[PDB]
Structure formats: C-alpha cells, structure tokens
Amino acid sequence: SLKKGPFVDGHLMTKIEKLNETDKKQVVKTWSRRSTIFPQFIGHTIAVYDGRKHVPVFISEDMVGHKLGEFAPTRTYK
Amino acid sequence: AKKSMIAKQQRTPKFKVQEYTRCERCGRPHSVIRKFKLCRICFRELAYKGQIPGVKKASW
Amino acid sequence: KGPVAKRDVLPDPIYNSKLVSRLINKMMIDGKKGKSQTILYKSFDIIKERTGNDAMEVFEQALKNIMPVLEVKARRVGGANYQVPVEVRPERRTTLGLRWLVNYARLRGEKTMEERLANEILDAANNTGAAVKKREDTHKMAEANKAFA
Amino acid sequence: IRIRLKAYDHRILDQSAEKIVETAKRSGASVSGPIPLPTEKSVYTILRAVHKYKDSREQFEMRTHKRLIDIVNPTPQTVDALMRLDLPSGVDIEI
Amino acid sequence: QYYGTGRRKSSVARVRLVPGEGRIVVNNREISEHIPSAALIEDIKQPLTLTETAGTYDVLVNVHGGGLSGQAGAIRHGIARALLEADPEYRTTLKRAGLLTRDARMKERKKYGLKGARRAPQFSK
Amino acid sequence: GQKVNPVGLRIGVIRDWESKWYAGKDYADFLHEDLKIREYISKRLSDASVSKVEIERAANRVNITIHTAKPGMVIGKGGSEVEALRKALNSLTGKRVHINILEIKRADLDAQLVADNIARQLENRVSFRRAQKQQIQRTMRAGAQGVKTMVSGRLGGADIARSEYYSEGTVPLHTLRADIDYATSEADTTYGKLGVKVWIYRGEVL
Amino acid sequence: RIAGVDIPRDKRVVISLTYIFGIGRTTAQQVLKEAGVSEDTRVRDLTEEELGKIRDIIDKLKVEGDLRREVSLNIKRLIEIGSYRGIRHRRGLPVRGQNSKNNARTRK
RNA sequence: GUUGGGCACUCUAAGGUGACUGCCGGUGACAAACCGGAGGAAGGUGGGGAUGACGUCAAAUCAUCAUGCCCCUUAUGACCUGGGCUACACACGUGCUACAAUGGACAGAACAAAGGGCAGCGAAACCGCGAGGUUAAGCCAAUCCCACAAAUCUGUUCUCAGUUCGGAUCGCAGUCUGCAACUCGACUGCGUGAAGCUGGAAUCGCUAGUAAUCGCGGAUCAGCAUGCCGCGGUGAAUACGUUCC
C-alpha cells in the first residue's frame, strides 16, 4: 500500500458513512480486520472479529495509521 | 473432501490469487508440475507407462 | 587397499622450490592460492630485507630445525594408554614441519601473516621459537616413552 | 524457407531431415545441409516415495533437439514437393 | 602458423604459434594484462621451456570458457599440441611432462540427498 | 523399496513412446486429452481386451493405433464398431480421430493381456496357483525366453497377505537391451484387492 | 563535544561522527560534503571554522536526545493505545512477525 | 563479427573409431589373475550416473490414488468470512551469518558453466539515493532477454578494539506483488546498534576437480528460499596402516 491510497472495505466504509451522516450509534460488527483507519472513523466503536468473538474497540486520534486487526490479538496466551 | 475440492479448483473463484494449481489426474495440490499439468506421483506413473512423450530416465 | 600417493608442482616464479609451493598449497584458506602466494612472497621479501640473506637458505634452516625425527604414536593394550615412538619417514618430516610453521605462525599474532610467517621463519632459524616448542616436546615424548620403540 | 525440425528422437528427426534435404536437392534448390542445432533439455527431479523420504529421488529428462534446413534457390517445384511430403508427428516442421 | 586446440576444465583455448620472438597474445591482450598470479605464467610456459621454444614463436591465443587457471590449462595444452605440430621430435618430453593428457577432471555432477556431490548433510542418531 | 518398472526403464533405449507427437503450446492439454482417450477406450474395450493405445497428433488430426490380439471383436461387422468408436472420440475430444487397429498374433506374449487373463481368473475364483502356472505354460509354449508372474494380496487367506512368484526362463531386468513387457493388473475380489504383476522377457536385439 | 557527547579524536571524521546517536555512515558522508572537510582528516586535526560548520550542520539535524525521546514516544504510543505490535514491544516477543518456538533471543 | 567473405578453428549434433590386460617383460601352475613398461586423449570395471537379487523391519504411505471391512449421514458431508497450521517458559535435529587482517570499506581490470521466457523474458532511454518506476525495441528464442557473474587480481584506507568486526533487534520513511502484506510477505532508504573475540562433555563430513570456499540457474510460484535440485569459479591436506570403534 504505497501510492494507490489507503485501504478500506467498501461495506465498512458504507456503514461508517451511514453512521457519520447523522451521528454515532451502537457498535459495528465487522469481520474486516484488513482495513486501515481513516480519520473519519474516530469515535465510532466497532466490533472486530478476532476469530471467535466480536471485540469492541473505540477509535482515537492516535489509532489511525494502523489497521483494525492491530487491536484484536487472535491467540490467547496465559 | 476430494470431489468437492477438485470441483472448487475447477471453478473460477472470486479472485485470481485464490486460484491454485491442481492434479488433473489424481486429486491433490502440493507438487503439480506446470508443464505436464500433473501431480508428481502420477507423473512418475504415466512416465513409466510409456506416455508423456518427452521424459525418460535422466543421467548425465 | 594399499598405499596411494600424491603430487605437487615444481616451480615458484621467484624462489624456485618444490616445498615452497607445498607451503603455498598449505595455509590456503577456502581455495585461495592467490592470497597464500601473496602472503608467501611478501613474507619472503621481508625475510630478504630484515636479514640481508637469501630467504631460501633461511627457510631450509627453519625446516631443518622443525622436522621431527620421532613422532609418538598410540598403543592402548588393556588399560594402559601407552604412546609408542615412531621413526618418521622424511615426507612426514617435511609436512609436519610445514604444519608447525603455518600453525604456530598464525597462532602468534602480529599485523599480517606476512609478518607472522616471516618472524616464525626467523625464530625457527635460530632454533628457539614457538613451533620448536612442539618439536622439542615431541622429542621429549619420544624420549620418555623410549622403552617400547 | 528455413525449416527447423525439432523432435524427441534423433533417428526420426534424421530421417525427416534427409527427406526434405533430398526432395529439395533433386529439384535444384541448392540444399545447405542439416545444420544440427543445440538441444533444449529439461530435468525434472521427483521424490520417489509416496509419503516420506526426501532423500530418495528420481530424475527424469526431456530432450528436444532441432536441426535447421535452408532452401536458397526459389525453384517452386521444391515447394510443391514439400507440400506433399507426409512425414510423421514426431518432428514439427515450421518453415 | 602452427595451430593447436587446448581444452581444460570447461575452457577451450586456440593457440596459434607464429614465427616470432616471444609475445603471447590472449584475446588481443597480453599475458599479465589478462593472467595475473605468475605461477600460472610459469606453468603456462612449461612446454615452451622443456623443448627450446623460448624466442622462436610469438603466440596468439583465442580463449573462451572456464576460469583463469582453467584458461591457463587450456593455453598450455594448446601450446603443447601446436608445438607438436611444429616439430614431432620432443613428444617424449611433453608426454613425460603430461602435456598430451587433457586432464579430464570435470567438476562432478551434484547428487540428490547429498549437499555437494560427495558431501553427506550431517548424521545424527 | 524395490525394482524400477522395466517399461519405464527401457523408454528411449529400445521401447518406443506410446504417445508420440511434439509439443506445441498445449502439451499439457494434449496429454490430458489423451489420458481421457486412454481411460475411455480402455474402459470400453476392457470387455474386448485391448492392451495398448498409441496416439499421434497430426496438425488437427489424431491417429490412434490399437493393439488388441483379436480383430473381429473391435473392427467386427465393420460399420458398427467404427461408428461407436470414432464418433464418440470425435465428440469427447473435439476434432478428427482416425483409428488403426493392429492385431497381436501370439496373444499370450503381451503382458497387459496376460496380466488381465490372470486377473480375470482370480475374479473367476480360479486358484492362484492354477492361474499363474497355466499361464506360464501358455506363454512358454507361445514362445518367450522367460516369464515371471507375481501375485500379491489376500490370496483367500485372511490376516496375512503375501507375494507369490512363479517364473520360467530368463527374465533379466538388469540387461538394458532386453525388450521386456511389464504390466500390472488389479483384481478386486470379495476379500479385497489382489495385484498381478506379469513381465515377459521375449528376446533381445543385438 | 559536538552534540553534547564525545567523538574520538584519533579516528577519521566520517566514523568519529558515527558514535553520535543519530548519525551513521551515510549521514556522516552527507554532512562532510556540505561542510567540506573532504573526509580525510582526524578530528584532532581540524580548525574551529571547519569543526563549527560540522557542529551547526549537526545542530540542524535530528540527532542527540530528540531521537531517543521521540522513539520512546512512538513505542509508548503503540503500547498505550492497545496495538498488538506494542504488545510485542512490551512482553519481550518479536515485533516484526517472527517465529517464537525458536530463537527470538534479542528479546528475552 | 558490425558488414561483405569462409568452413578452415571452436562450437553444435548424428554416424563412427577408440581401451580390450590388447602388446612387452616379470611373477604365479603354464591357468585365472597380478606388478611395472611402451603407445595413447584415455590403463586396467578411466570419472560419474542409471540399474537396487531372495528377503529383513506385520518398517512407511487408507492423506497421491484404488481399496475389503467398520462408522457418519438435514452430517464425521457442503458453502461462506475470520483465525490458526508463523503460539513460546523450554529442550532438540538441519542450516545461514559472524566473531575478523588470508579482514572491512572505497575505486579499476578480467574470466564461467548450465538453465528458463508468450498475456511470459523484457533491452535501451528517462526518473528516483535505492528497492524500483514510465514509454518501449527485440524475442515462441545457439539470434533477443533474464545476464551488470562472485570470490579473484590491482591501487587507496582503518590498524587489532567488541572496532571502519558483525548484523540481530527495533523506530521512521518507502517499493513491489496481489480484493487485501494487522496477526503473517520479500526488498530498499535513514537511524539504533545487540549476543558474539573460534565454542564443555560429546560429535559429523570428505580419498580429487573431492573437501573448503564463491557466485549463477531452475522447479515450486502473483508474491515469498538461508531449503532443495543442478551449474560453473578458485581449489587443498592426508591415507604409515587394520591395533581399536
């Protein structure tokens, strides 16, 4: 991902822009972990699928340059 | 799972990168040679049975 | 089975000796005769410079000091672990001399193996030196175990 | 008119080489001879065993060798002779 | 122009001995311009030193293949062959020196299950 | 870990290719078309006892030669056999198919038909000594300098399966000018799967 | 000394400048071209002109405590926000995605 | 070598010839064979490969395949996304890189083999520090490309230190492939720079173009190689011997 742009899925972009056209709501259950965080996501609590559950994460100013799956480890260890 | 997996490979998937090479005679991936479109063990069998018009035993 | 033998190349463009090319094939690391030839000729040019002599005769004198008469082989009978002294046949005298030159030269430590080989030849000429410790000690091991022959 | 035969057997390609050589030589086309060109061969190494034994292999060999034929004088009698040469599937004429 | 081919270790040299004074010309370059490490220069000159050929032929060499010691072997083999074609006399001298052998020591083919055509990988029990 | 198959060992020395053409641009596709051909034709004529199929590829045309050891089961009444044989091949391949059927005189020297003849008798519940010895007498009278028939599997004996050699004459698998027919066949019986391996040293070429 | 930390007097300039936290070899060669010391001098042998140009060029560059404090800020940032890569920063398990049943022995 | 020209030469690939203890001498029974010699490119199965006897381990493979029997069946079968097979306190096989002056860095000069390329190989030019990028020649290939070989050799430089050794780890910035590189890709650029100064008991490989070392290639494959499979480059040391394992 170099100069083509950042990446997001179109469905998650659709859900977030429906959320952003009026105001925030409940969590978004989203299996996409592959997608970067645009600055327009900030404040939207979204539920990333780790493999077996939907973990809710609240997006801040810092949590932008990374992706969604950085905030859900998939492997439980001790 | 053999005829299902063979059928799934014989399809066109959603993406070209989901496409992988497969047997064409004895259903398995892992070591399908691109030239013969054949699995490794089936290549040894058919190349022993006088088919596959190029290959004989190698020595140099 | 039976014994098999090997060969070696006669000249060196300066210092025309068999055994100096035998030392060239020795101390060769990783298949580089070029580096060992460079080390050898720069070392013998130091031996020609630092002592105003031809380095052939100094090199043979160093060999003569190092070439061991008596190896001490092994012979374990029962629980005894005896070492038995062997009159060395002179091919192995030259090759043990070259191994001891090369090994104790690179074991010495100076600012090139040019200098280490030069100073090890200069020490083995006037017999007291580092490889000649091994010469003396092998003759001492043969002297102690002389009861078996 | 640069006919490059390439085959798997040397004897079949020799037979199909000198057949074109003679049929073009008889009608005056000044046949430069069968220039033997380097073979492209490929080696396919294969685990013999069904399941284990990476150390146990077998090597197979596919050689395709090619020879070049040139026809220099026009002599279209030779072209009509080449069009009716029926030589087998082993050799792959490509003019 | 006596001509001789020399082969050594996947290298082939073409040595033509022209009647001259002793210049050796390797691919329109001279000796140390193309072969350093003068042990190869004395080994490449040995057929010309055993029989007296010291300044009676210039040498022109067209070499291809191998490496620099392989090219040295190919040049000295071509020298001995063209220098037999010069005079048939001293073939006993060249043959006692080697020089009509073409050392057939090709690099061996790597075998499967081995690292390097003799090397076993490592044994553990 | 044992013997290389002698068929695959003598390919490109004396024994020819069965599949004879040259690769243009769809070598894999020609191969697997010919695998479909050989499957279809060996299934259909496993009644009519066809051993081997040699396929040509002749610039949109395929010449299939068939070694059967009987003509009039496979060329038959003339019309019906060539109809049902060339017509379905023209369909399931997609281009022209010509069929030339060479007949094997001495039906007992081709190891494919011999191994099938031993396999059928095991499926006909004939004892596994009678099959191999009867067939060895048939082959050694049909004229062969050596025959070896080896049958393995559950021979009608449950909890131990073993290999059985019968042979007569020289079968020299190490002489690389030998001209040996090797052939396997399988026999699915009520007790499991039997494996017949027959190979027939027929004579060498100087 | 130059960035509040020493450089060795008896080395050449290109490699005495390497010991400053923030300058390796290639930024040192980018400096000494701009300064014009021609890369072949000791730093025990310079002039106050020739070393003052080195000083204020390095003063323009992000070198001494800036680098450590900002890289600690980046590490603390992705430790505090969550961020599995910072979990690897914390625990002593490798960050860039590396197998851990074997070595991983820079980190524990 | 571009052109005209030539098949001499290399090379290529077909048919040959050729090495058989054949000839000499010696030994031994005169045999079989053995030791040396001459010739010869080749000397005693010339080097290698392929070839793996009857059988042994109820060895391995029901997961390449085919399978007898037993089990499941709106599920022990099938689709879809996400994860995992990359976990990590530990042990343990195989490997790679080093610990350094026969070295490191910087500049110049040369020498290879073998193999791959059609929706693929991709020149040259341009831009970018670089990974690479844009336009595009040629190539279904002894032509054109991959492909600028590397150790090497020759100058400059450091001077024996945890360093001008080593590159781990890591932050930042990039590039390419691909719906998508977060777990989980390779590579580049800047910076950080660790353990390590030749390894206890024990232990492995190799008898010659071999070991050691250096690069190149190809399968697999969009992309991923330190693995494997081949190729060349330089290129050794030793074998008294069968006392011991």
Distance, in Å, from the CA atom of G86 to the CA atom of G104, rounded to the nearest integer, reads 16
Which of helix, strand or coil describes residue G34? Answer: helix
E87 torsion bin: left (phi>0), alpha (psi -120 to 50), beta (else): beta
E12 in contact with nucleic chain H (CB within 7 A): yes
A with G: how many residue pairs have Cβ under 8 Å apart? 21
**And the tokens for G8?**
């060795």
- Exposure pattern of F148-183 as b/e (b: 16+ CB <10 Å)? bbebbbbbeeeeeeeeeebebeebebeeeebbbbbb
Is strand H within 7 Å of residue D59 (CB)?
yes
Mind telling me how many Å the CA of E42 is from chain C's nearest CA?
A: 6
Counting CB pairs under 8 A, whether chains A and G reach 3 or more, is: yes
Which two structure tokens, joined as six digits, stand for A75? Answer: 């492997």
State the Cα–Cα distance between residues B29 and B6, nearest whole angstrom: 10
How far apart CA E5 and CA E85 sit, in angstroms, is 11
Q: Write the DSSP symbol of residue E58.
A: E
Inter-residue contact F171 to F201 (CB < 8 Å): yes
C-alpha closest to that of G3 among G70, G54, G68? G54
**Angle at the Cα of D19 (from D17 to D24), degrees rounded to 5?**
100
Q: Residue C72 and residue C82: Cα distance in Å, rounded?
A: 10
CA distance F9 to chain B (A): 7
User: For strand H, is any atom closer than 7 Å to the CB of E114?
Assistant: yes
Q: Are F139 and F200 in contact (CB under 8 A)?
A: yes
- The radius of gyration of chain B's CA atoms, rounded to the nearest angstrom, is 14
E35 bridge partner residues: none
Who among C11, C33, C34 is closest to E42 (CB)? C11
Q: Write the residue in C13, C24, C33 that is nearest to E42 by C-beta.
A: C13
What is the rounded distance in angstroms from the CA atom of residue F176 to the CA atom of residue F16?
Answer: 14
Nearest residue to D59 via CA among F184, B40, G43, E83: B40
Contact, F34 vs F19, CB < 8 A? Answer: yes
Q: How distant is the Cα of E69 from the closest Cα of chain C, in angstroms?
A: 11
Helices within A1-78 (DSSP H only): 10-21
Name the phi and psi angles at C70, rounded to 5: -125, 105
**DSSP state, C111?**
S
Tell me the nt nearest to C5, Cα to C1'.
H239
| Partners of chain C (3+ Cβ pairs below 8 A) | E
Q: Is B36 on the interface with F (CB under 8 A)?
A: yes
How far is C49 from C119, CA to CA, in rounded Å? Answer: 12
Q: Is the CB of E89 under 7 A from strand H?
A: no
Cα separation values, F64 from C55, F21, F86, F97, Å: 83, 12, 10, 7
Contact flag, residue C90 CB and nucleic strand H, below 7 A: no
Find the nucleotide nearest D52 (Cα to C1′). Answer: H60
Q: What φ, ψ does residue F173 adopt, rounded to 5°?
A: -75, -5
Expressed in Å, this structure's resolution amounts to 3.1
Amino acid letter at E98? G
Q: Return the closest-CA partner of residue F115 out of F1, F194, F9.
A: F194
Which residues of B are known binding-site members for Zn(2+)? 23, 26, 39, 42
Which token pair is C18? Answer: 């068999």
Q: Which residues of B touch D (CB under 8 A)?
A: 31, 33, 35, 40-41, 43-44, 47, 53-60
The residue whose CA lies nearest the C1' of nucleotide H90 is G101
Residue C86: alpha-carbon gap to chain centroid: 18
Residue where the block lists tokens 């070499």: E63
Q: For residue E115, list chain D residues with Cβ-Cβ distance below 8 A.
A: none
Contacts of F31 (CB under 8 A, 6+ apart): B36, B37, B38, B51, B52, F19
The enclosing H or E element of F138 equals helix F130-142
In this structure, which amino acid lies at residue F12?
Answer: G
CB D30 within 8 A of CB D73: yes
Burial class (CB in 10 A: 0-12, 13-18, 19+), D17: buried
**Token pair listed for F153:** 């599997």
In degrees and rounded to multiples of 5, residue F195 shows phi and psi of -125, 120
Task: Quote the CA–CA distance of A70 and A36 in Å, as a whole number.
Answer: 10
Question: Cβ of E41 and C13 within 8 Å?
Answer: yes
Do the chains contact at C34 and E43, CB–CB below 8 Å? no
In this structure, what token pair is assigned to residue E3? 């001509």
CB of F29 nearer than 7 A to strand H: no
The pair of three-digit structure tokens given for residue E78, joined into one six-digit string:
């071509």
Strand H nucleotides within 7 Å of a protein CB: 9-15, 39-43, 46-56, 58-69, 77-95, 101-103, 110-113, 115-116, 118, 140-142, 149-154, 157-160, 163-164, 168-185, 189-194, 203-214, 219-222, 228-242
- Identity (one letter) of the amino acid at E6? G
How far is residue E73's CA from residue E105's CA, in Å, rounded to a whole number? Answer: 12
From F43's Cα to the closest Cα of chain B, the distance in A is 16
Does the CB of F48 have a partner CB in chain B at under 8 Å? no
Look-up: residue for tokens 């399908």? Answer: B32
Q: What one-character-per-residue DSSP string does G46-80 give?
A: --HHHHHHHHHHHHHSS-SSHHHHHHHHHHHHHHH
